[PDB]
Structure 1
Amino acid sequence: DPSDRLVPELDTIVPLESTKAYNMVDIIHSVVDEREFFEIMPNYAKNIIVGFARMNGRTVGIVGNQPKVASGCLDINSSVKGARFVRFCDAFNIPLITFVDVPGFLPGTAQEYGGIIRHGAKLLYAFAEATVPKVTVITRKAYGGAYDVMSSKHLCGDTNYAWPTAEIAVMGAKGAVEIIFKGHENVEAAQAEYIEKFANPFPAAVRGFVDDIIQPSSTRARICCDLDVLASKKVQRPWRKHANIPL
C-alpha cells in the first residue's frame, strides 16, 4: 500500500447542510492501510470511536467522534472510553490520530448529577499528558471548551489540519448574537455578518491555531509524511512519582 495514495471519495463525504450526519467510520476506513480497522468497544458509547490501525506499516491508535450517533456530543461514558485508550496508547508508545467533529457536551440534569465534569477532566488530562506523536484533523466543527478536550494545538499537539468544510468558533451563531448584540435587538443583519465572518476556519488559521487547510483527498498523504518526522519525538518534563489522575 503506497503512502501517497489519494482518496477522492472524501471530497464530498461531509454534507453541506449542518443538520445532516455522516459516518466517520467510512473516513477511517478510507484513510488507513488496506481498509483495515480493529475497533475497541464497538457497541458501548457509540458516539466515540476508538481502535487500532496501521499507517505505512506502523501501528497507530485512531480516536474520533461519531456525528451519526447523538450528533457527536460527549457524555460520561465516552470520556472514560477515550481516556483509557489514550492512556494505554501513550503508555506503550503508539502514535495517535484524531478526527474532530464535536458540538460540545450533552446537557441535562442526569449528566450533571452523574459528574460529567470529572469525566471531561479525565479525557482532557488524557490528551494533555500525551507525549507520543499526535496528528489531528478537524472535519466540520469544534465548539467551546470541547475543542480543547480533543487535543487542540495548545495542548502540546504536533500537527493540526482542517478541511475546507470545517469551522471553529466559541458557540453557535444564535448564542453569540443573543449574548453580544442584546441592546441592538436586531439579529437580521447581525447573524448574517457573524456567519459570514466567523463561520469558517480562517480566524483560527490567521492566528496560527491550525497548521494548514488541506483538501480531503490528500489527507492520507499528509499524515504518513508527518509520522515519518515525528518518530523521534522526545519531551522532557519535571520529575514526579506519579501525577494525580481525577479518577
Structure 2
Amino acid sequence: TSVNERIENKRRTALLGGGQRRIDAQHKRGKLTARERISLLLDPGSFVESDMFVEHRCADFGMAADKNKFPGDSVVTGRGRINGRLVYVFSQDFTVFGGSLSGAHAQKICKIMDQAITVGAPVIGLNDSGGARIQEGVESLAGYADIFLRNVTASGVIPQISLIMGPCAGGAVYSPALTDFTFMVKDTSYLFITGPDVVKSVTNEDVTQEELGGAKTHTTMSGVAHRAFENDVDALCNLRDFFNYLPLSSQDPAPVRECHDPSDRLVPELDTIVPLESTKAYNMVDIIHSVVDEREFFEIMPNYAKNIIVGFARMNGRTVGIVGNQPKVASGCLDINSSVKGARFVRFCDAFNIPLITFVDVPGFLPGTAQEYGGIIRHGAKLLYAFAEATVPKVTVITRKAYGGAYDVMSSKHLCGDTNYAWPTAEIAVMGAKGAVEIIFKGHENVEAAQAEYIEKFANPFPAAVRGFVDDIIQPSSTRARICCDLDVLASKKVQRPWRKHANIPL
C-alpha cells in the first residue's frame, strides 16, 4: 500500500465517522449527523475542515487497538462563512464513542477558539455529548478546563452562540452557561448534570428524561434556554437568520444592512393601542412589530418571564435590541425572573455596540413572600445595573405607567440615557393618585376634593416633563421616525468612565 492510498482511506473513514449502522440509528432517531448539520449551517462550499487526521493518544484499556482509532476523534471543527461573513464552528459527533469528550477532542475545539479570538470571528457550537470519556480519566477534565478558560476569555470579544441538538451531561453543560445565547431543539435535546438514575438513587422522587432536562423545561421554567426550535433543519435555518443580526467582534459597530422600509413613515396604528382605562391591559407586542423594520422581530424566551419582552430587530438597517414590559401578564410588574432575563440581554447588547430601545409600562414590583424570600431586592438590582452601566445609545419610550422605583430601573433618563419620549397617556409618579392622596391628606376634611385636585394635576405626563425627565411628548404615530432619527445620530457617541479592573454587578 502506497502513502497516497493510505491517505485516501483515512479521508473516507473520517467522513464516515462511527460507521454506517450508527448513522442509521441517528437518522431513525430523527437527527442529522454532525457533518450534515454543518453543510446546512454554512454557505455552500465555504467550509474548511481542520485537523481531520487527529487521533487520540490514549493507549490504556485497549484504546491502543486499531478498532478504536477513529480519525476526527468525535468532533467536526473548522471555519466557513454565512452570507459571506466569516464564522468558526464546531459540531460534536455522537457516532464516535458516544460523542464523549477526550483530551484531543477539547484540543481541536480550543484551537479554533484561539483563531476566532485572534482574527475577531464569532464561534457557533452545536453540542451533543454524553459527557467525559472515562477511559482517559483526568485528561478529559483538563479538556473541560481549557475550553472553559477560552469561553471566559472570549466573553465581550466575540459573540458565542450555542445550539444544543441532543443530550448533554457532565461538565459539558457549563459551556452553554458561559456563551451568550443558548438554543435547544424541542423533544430532541436535553440538558442535565446527572441523569434520572442518580436523582432516584439520591432522593426518593420519580422523574423521566424529558422532565429532568427537557427543552420545554429549560425554555419555560428554569430560564436557561433562550428558544427551542421544532427540529434540526428548522433550528439551523433560524440560526442562520439570527446570525445575520450580530457583529463579528466587539470592535465592530452593529451591522447595517440594506433596507427598503422608509425610515420616515408614520404608524397610525399606534395611536389607539393604549387604552384610557387604567385597568385594561394591552399587548405590547403590537407596538414592537409596528415600529421595527418590515415588522420582523426576533423574540427571545417567548415562554419564560412573559411579563418582559426582549429581542432583536432592525431599524433603518441597523441591528437594535428591544426591551419592554408586557402589561398583558401580571399587570406588567417586575419580578425575579423578568429581572434576570432583562439584565442578561441588555449586557450582551451593550458589550457589542447594539443600541437599546426600551418600551416602559411598569406599575411596580410583584408583591408577596414568594418574591421577598427569593431575593427580589438582590435580583431587581441586576436590571438597574445592566442599564446604568451601558454606554451604547439608549432610547426610551414610556407608553402608560411608570410608578415607583421601577421608573428608574426601566432605563430612565437619569441613568445616562440619550432620549426619553412619553406618549400622551404616560404617567410618572411615586405611586398612583389613590395611595398618594390617602397618605398626603390624612385626617383632613373634604378629602374627595383633594383627590380630584391631585388627579387633575399629577395623573398625566406633565409633572415629570416640566422637570426635564422627558424630552418631548409625542404622538404615537410618529414614534418610529423619532427613534430612527436618534439612532442615526447617536451611533458615533462615545462616553468616558473611570478606570476599573472589572465590573462588580450585584449578582
Q: TM-score, normalised by structure 1?
A: 0.99
Deviation of 1:243 (Å): 1.8
Deviation of 1:186 (Å): 3.7
Deviation of 1:172 (Å): 1.2
Query: After alignment, is 221-230 or 169-178 more displaced?
Result: 169-178
User: Which of 313, 324, 338 matches 1:64?
Assistant: 324
User: Which of 120, 124, 127 matches 2:380?
Assistant: 120
* Structure-1 residue corresponding to 2:58: none
Per-residue Cα deviation, 1:5-41 (whole angstroms, up to 9, x for no partner)? 1100111111110010000100000000000000000
Q: 1:242 to 1:185 in 2, by over 3 A?
A: farther
Deviation of 1:179 (Å): 1.0
Point out the structure with max Rg over C-alpha. Answer: 2
The CA distance in 2 between the partners of 1:24 and 1:93, in whole Å, is: 25
Identity of aligned residues (%): 100
The CA distance in 1 between the partners of 2:456 and 2:448, in whole Å, is: 13
Per-residue Cα deviation, 1:99-138 (whole angstroms, up to 9, x for no partner)? 0000000000110000000111111000100100000000
The CA distance in 1 between the partners of 2:272 and 2:432, in whole Å, is: 24
What SS does the corresponding residue of 1:68 show, helix, strand or coil? coil
Per-residue Cα deviation, 1:40-80 (whole angstroms, up to 9, x for no partner)? 00000000000000000000000000000110000000000
The CA distance in 1 between the partners of 2:441 and 2:415, in whole Å, is: 32
The CA distance in 1 between the partners of 2:407 and 2:445, in whole Å, is: 30
Deviation of 1:185 (Å): 4.8
The CA distance in 2 between the partners of 1:209 and 1:244, in whole Å, is: 28
Per-residue Cα deviation, 1:132-167 (whole angstroms, up to 9, x for no partner)? 000000000100010000111110000000001111
Question: What RMSD in Å do the two structures reach over aligned CA positions?
Answer: 0.7
* Structure-2 residue corresponding to 1:53: 313
Per-residue Cα deviation, 1:186-223 (whole angstroms, up to 9, x for no partner)? 43111111110000111111111100000000000100
User: Which of 411, 427, 439 matches 1:179?
Assistant: 439
The CA distance in 2 between the partners of 1:29 and 1:228, in whole Å, is: 20
* Structure-1 residue corresponding to 2:118: none
Structure 1 stretches of 4+ moved >2 Å: none
The CA distance in 1 between the partners of 2:383 and 2:447, in whole Å, is: 36
The CA distance in 2 between the partners of 1:157 and 1:47, in whole Å, is: 23
Structure 1 segment 78-227 matched on structure 2, within 5 A: 78-227=338-487
The CA distance in 2 between the partners of 1:65 and 1:179, in whole Å, is: 28
What SS does the corresponding residue of 2:359 show, helix, strand or coil? strand
Deviation of 1:2 (Å): 0.2
Gapped regions of structure 1 (runs ≥ 5): none
What SS does the corresponding residue of 2:395 show, helix, strand or coil? strand
Bigger RCO of structures 1 and 2 (CA < 8 A, at least 6 apart): 1
Query: After alignment, is 199-208 or 38-47 more displaced?
Result: 199-208
Deviation of 1:183 (Å): 2.2
What SS does the corresponding residue of 1:208 show, helix, strand or coil? coil
- The total of aligned residue pairs comes to 247
The CA distance in 1 between the partners of 2:456 and 2:330, in whole Å, is: 27
Gapped regions of structure 2 (runs ≥ 5): 1-260
The CA distance in 2 between the partners of 1:158 and 1:203, in whole Å, is: 20
User: Which of 211, 219, 230 matches 2:490?
Assistant: 230
* Structure-2 residue corresponding to 1:33: 293
What SS does the corresponding residue of 2:278 show, helix, strand or coil? coil
The CA distance in 1 between the partners of 2:314 and 2:384, in whole Å, is: 25
Q: TM-score, normalised by structure 2?
A: 0.48
The CA distance in 1 between the partners of 2:348 and 2:331, in whole Å, is: 27
The CA distance in 1 between the partners of 2:445 and 2:490, in whole Å, is: 51
